Amino acid sequence: GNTLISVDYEIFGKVQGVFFRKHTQAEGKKLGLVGWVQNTDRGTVQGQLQGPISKVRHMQEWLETRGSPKSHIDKANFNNEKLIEELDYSDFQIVA
């Protein structure tokens, strides 16, 4: 479609200390997405994605299967997937 969606994500495995945040931001920006990425307090990576639905879906697949080159992804959990009519962000940020 040419609709917009928002979705929350959390990635499990060898996902911290592998340049995951930098690569996620770069891929998000390449895909024209806004949102954020952050290392959690439980050894995972999380955030939200917003943008054109096909681009969000491409990013979801990237988060399931690839991530940063030295990452090892066991699972990507997605939640709160929804259609949106406006963006809630103006950039794709790494949240410290």
Numbering used by the authors: 4 to 99
Please share text taken word for word from the publication where this structure appeared.
As the sole target of neutralizing antibodies, the virion surface protein Env encodes a glycan shield to restrict the antibody access to antigenically conserved sites. Small protein mimics of the CONEs are designed by epitope transplantation and used as immunogens to focus the antibody response. Here we focus our protein design efforts on four CONEs, including the structural elements of β sheet 12/13/22 (CONE 1), α2 helix (CONE 2), loop C (CONE 4), and loop E (CONE 5).
The CONE 4 (loop C) residues were grafted onto the C-terminal loop region of an α/β mixed protein. A characteristic array of three glutamic acids flanked by hydrophobic residues defines the conformation of CONE 4 loop in Env. Our design largely recapitulates the conformations of two charged side chains (E88 and E89). The hydrophobic residue L86 also adopts a similar conformation to L265 of Env. Comparison with the Env trimer protein revealed a high degree of mimicry: within the epitope region, the Cα RMSDs between the designed proteins and Env were 0.42 Å (C2S5) and 0.34 Å (C4S3), respectively, suggesting that our CONE mimetics accurately display the Env residues. The electron density maps revealed that the side chains of the grafted residues were well positioned relative to the computational model. As a control experiment, we also immunized five rabbits with a synthetic peptide of the CONE 4 sequence (LAEEEI). None of these rabbits could induce antisera of significant titers, in contrast to the C4S3-immunized rabbits, indicating that for a linear epitope, constraining it in the right conformation with suitable protein scaffolds is favorable for the generation of functional antibodies. The CONE 4 (loop C) and CONE 5 (loop E) immunogens did induce HIV-specific antibodies as assessed by ELISA and western blot assay. The purified IgG fractions of anti-CONE 4 and anti-CONE 5 rabbit sera bound to the deglycosylated form of gp120 but not the glycosylated protein. Most of the animals immunized with C4S3 also generated antibodies that bound to the deglycosylated SOSIP Env protein, whereas no such antibodies were detected in animals immunized with C5S3.
